[PDB]
């Protein structure tokens, strides 16, 4: 197994590791070894989750610069508008679908938390203008060294536009200086893609361990409200993939049933790794090999959509907010519905392509809309039972995130006439 | 539409923006729209301030490394000693002007502000040696993140000197590596200059918004002895321009009237944007096109003196601390005034080149007169009105700061015989 | 005269610094002047510690990147991986011998300059696995900012390996971008080596000031424990040679006495010239003649060996970290005695060629093990002494470095059957 392992195709490796981890977790729960797997196996899962975070800031700083500097600034404006309007519209529709399914399945209806009416009057703090300001970084190095991906995306796009303006300057000193800066960033982006492709070789172990621990420990609590919220979130993600992307691809002229069988390379790799930004190379190659989108369009829309376009995270937050609110004996309202429609999206735009950041930004959206939790509050008792099925729904959440990443680049490229129609026919 | 506005020559549209903002603020104070302006108009000003602060660490680090690495070791040492003794001399003389002006105006006396002086009487020096040690960055990346300007200036200078020493090695691998590092930093500085060009093209709207909000809210509040502060600060500035610069220019030979005629471009573009590191391009342009100064002088002095040389911040700090100390009813003795001078100089250096930074650094000199910034105390009740007038105070501050940086560059140039004397002839 | 100051050997200069520091401190403490040396003198020796901490993080990141880019599974053949595994293994065992002998001699036991029993008593030590998977950084820029050494050594090694894997790609843009990124990091490492040269030139004054303040405020017996640290390091080096190689050499089937009775020509000149890189010519000469190793592999094992295989420096760090940890008061624990091993080995993988590499690679280990070097704490006072006797430890640790390189060459030659066994008869 010295190289039979490392040579095996990484997709089938992860897809095998997932099922082995599932069966092994169920068996370790059976034989009663929950603590055993929590002590001896989970450290490798945590190592994987920590490996998938050194590949978020370098790969979003050095890939946006190279993507935005490799486009004419006018085409960059046009493509960026066409793709950001799509990201926002689809995240909005995702939250809408999440709220619909959360109302339909009646998520968390019989939780029996003993909390009749905790708190709902603080539903509307969602500072909008302050966030649209916070996109701009008061200090770019602070936004890098603190973990905020949206300010560093803004600064990286600005730097890319500046470099592509420099590379057309009369002097030769500034021309070569800007070319060298762009080459530094190109080298960094490529080195990060290579490190990600190397971490993926360890992924068939660090996802084995993660799902082994999840199955072992929380394989029994998915019976009532938890099974209902899992069913709700996954039916919502299915509804999204079947309605939103399919309508958007049919109204433009892209066979959805073909787009899916083309994206099945990245859908899976994001489904099991649970990191829409650690599966970025597979997306940036499945959007160029199969779908044929030009290197100009995807190389900027995908490194941006990998972090700011999270339809699945929007949907998961929209469903779990309704869950935790029905868990405190007082559902949302119409006003609270639209408050979520905005706050969940303004949180999706922020959360990074990290395994299990949806839970953190979910706690954030709760601390926004009324349900403020203290370390002993009933809202906290309700939200704490979500981090159990965290992974079991994070998988589908990330799958929909990446599928949406792909069906936006395809739309933009089909509009811009940069879609190789020779690839879209059999 | 836009391209018409985008070509209207800036520095002649930003002034129109500022005057429209003054008119709008007065009209809003008339109709009592302070809240409407603060909620609709101010966010553009906040965005402009954040865009200005975004370009303070990268532009300083990059332009300073390039400047220090492009001159010489020895010529850099000489220019550095001359320009540092110049900045210290002018800051000291400016604080002396500030103190004598605050005394001559009887500022903050008839205000009969609270006399709660029971804990803020014991004055203490600023621990000078501790600051001179703080100049050395304990961790250069931590000093880039936390947004400290003097440690990053020190690291940039030492790195530039080291790169110049490297570029002379007999080897070739290390010479080419040094050239590549320096070209990275050159490209970064040039990209930051383009970004500042774009921000300053946006600056009409931002200036309109900021000064409109101010002249709406504080358009009626500056009637009483608070106008004494404006008179004092503006008199100190107007005379330090015509007593310190108009003498230091006649001792060395530069005709000061021609100096003003030539520096107008960088004067009325920093009087309205209130940022020294946001007029660094509109200063490095004038000190190369109209002043006629060698590139290897103003390419280091101006990025250096952008932050450490703040004569108007020093004068403003002196006058304002005198105002507060008179507001609580505690005068300053002649001996204590020297402590105030030294702390105002020390707070001029380590102040950011951003709008409204001296007011934030006003506490650093308020501590050295023994005063304390505890809430509810009269000290805060005067600091509030100071923060109110901060807008116009900072406009004047930055204008005289940039004029001082220009005059210091010109002095170092003429004493180095690099000042191209063919531009100073009628 | 300052040229004579810069011309005296940097290491033998710090020893006179330490000796005059001890003498001047004893005098000023016996004649009632402790305040004088603490207020006037001491800030020199504090600026020195600030200058040492300024250089750790850049010389860790930028040097590890180039180092790991010279040691890569993508440019290491069969002979390469053998010698690199041997180098890392023997450096690990050398740090372990250093820690063992430091525990045996009980170095720095009676220094007593520790403040008390504990400032953050028991420090809540994380589990061993929680500090084994705390090597991978969740954010590489945050680990640069917060000044963590292992989460940036790991990221730098990963980036370097990826960069080597790039420069062998069939493309041209990617290969060129990787070459440019490596040029950037090479230039940064060289600039840091220049700054380290300058700081170590300043180090006599800094060490003199630090030790003078120490001896003035409290008698700490600088002569006793240091006379024990030198003895402990030399016993560790003798043990390192005897055990670590005489075991390995006899395991791989080579007479150890027949190896030592030949390498004596290189050990002596490595002892005297104290520059392993400068001793490389005669090292290759002896490995050619006496060891009978063919040119094909000591043309590669010795050059690489004299720059990444620092067994003597590894043992020096292993012992002086124990000395510092036992001096400032709280002994060193397993969860830390393994971090010391990891950081010592993974920095030897990128050892700088400069007089003063042990000093930096010890400030780094004291920063990574959790004994932060800092301006004033007993860590700086117990680290200045080791920086003092650096010039006594160097003459032996260089001998151990060169003998380790020779033993590695002979071992790798035996495991591949290229021994001129006609040189090993009687
Ligand atoms: N980890 C997901 C986001 C989430 O699940 O919150 C992603 O990579 O986009
Ligand atoms: N506005 C000043 C800063 C300050 O006044 O604090 C400047 O020129 O940067």
UniProtKB/TrEMBL annotation, chains A, B, C:
Primary location recorded for the protein, binned into one broad class: membrane
Residue stretches in coiled coil: none
Keyword Ubl conjugation set for record: no
PROSITE patterns documented for this protein: NA_DICARBOXYL_SYMP_1
Residue ranges crossing the lipid bilayer per the database entry: 8-31, 51-71, 83-105, 149-167, 188-213, 233-252, 338-364, 376-393
Membrane topology: Multi-pass membrane protein
Any one GO cellular component localisation term in the record: plasma membrane
GO molecular function, one term: symporter activity
Record key words, sorted: Cell membrane, Membrane, Symport, Transmembrane, Transmembrane helix, Transport
Record's protein name: Proton/glutamate symporter, SDF family
Taxonomic path: Archaea, Methanobacteriati, Methanobacteriota, Thermococci, Thermococcales
């Amino acid at each position: 197994l010295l190289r039979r392992y490392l040579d095996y195709p990484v997709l089938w490796k992860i897809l095998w590791g997932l099922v082995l981890g599932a069966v092994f977790g169920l068996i370790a729960g059976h034989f009663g070894y929950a603590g055993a797997v929590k002590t001896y196996i989970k450290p490798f899962g945590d190592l994987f989750v920590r490996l998938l975070k050194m590949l978020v800031m370098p790969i979003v700083l050095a890939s946006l610069v190279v993507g935005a500097a490799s486009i004419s600034p006018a085409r960059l404006g046009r493509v960026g508008v066409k793709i950001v309007v799509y990201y926002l519209a689809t995240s909005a529709m995702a939250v809408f679908f999440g709220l619909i399914v959360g109302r339909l399945f009646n998520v968390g209806a019989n939780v029996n938390l003993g909390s009749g009416t905790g708190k709902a009057i603080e539903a509307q703090p969602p500072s909008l203008v302050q966030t649209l300001l916070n996109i701009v970084p008061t200090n770019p190095f602070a936004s890098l060294a603190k973990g905020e991906v949206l300010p560093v995306i803004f600064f990286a796009i600005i730097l890319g536009i500046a470099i592509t303006y420099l590379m057309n300057r009369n002097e030769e000193r500034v021309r070569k200086s800007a070319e060298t800066l762009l080459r530094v960033f190109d080298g960094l982006a490529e080195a990060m893609y290579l490190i990600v492709g190397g971490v993926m070789q360890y992924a068939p172990i660090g996802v084995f361990a993660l799902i082994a621990y999840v199955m072992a420990e929380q394989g029994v609590r998915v019976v009532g409200p938890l099974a209902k919220v899992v069913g709700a979130v996954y039916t919502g993600l299915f509804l999204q993939i079947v309605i939103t992307y399919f309508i958007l691809l049919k109204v433009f002229g892209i066979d959805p049933i073909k787009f899916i069988r083309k994206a099945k390379d990245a859908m899976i790799t994001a489904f099991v790794t649970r990191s829409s930004s650690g599966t970025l190379p597979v997306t940036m190659r499945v959007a160029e090999e199969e779908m044929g989108v030009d290197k100009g369009i995807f190389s900027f829309t995908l490194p941006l959509g990998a972090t700011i376009n999270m339809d699945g995270t929007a949907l998961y937050q929209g469903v779990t907010v309704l869950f935790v609110a029905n868990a405190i004996g007082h559902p949302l309202t119409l006003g609270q519905q639209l408050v979520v429609v905005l706050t969940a999206v303004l949180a999706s735009i922020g959360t990074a392509g990290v395994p299990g950041a949806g839970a953190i930004m979910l706690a954030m959206v709760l601390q926004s809309v009324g349900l403020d939790l203290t370390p002993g509050s009933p809202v906290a008792l309700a939200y704490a039972m979500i981090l159990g099925i965290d992974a079991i729904l994070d998988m589908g959440r990330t799958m929909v995130n990446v599928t949406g990443d792909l069906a936006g680049t395809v739309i933009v490229a089909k509009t811009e006439k940069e879609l190789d129609e020779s690839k879209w026919i059999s």
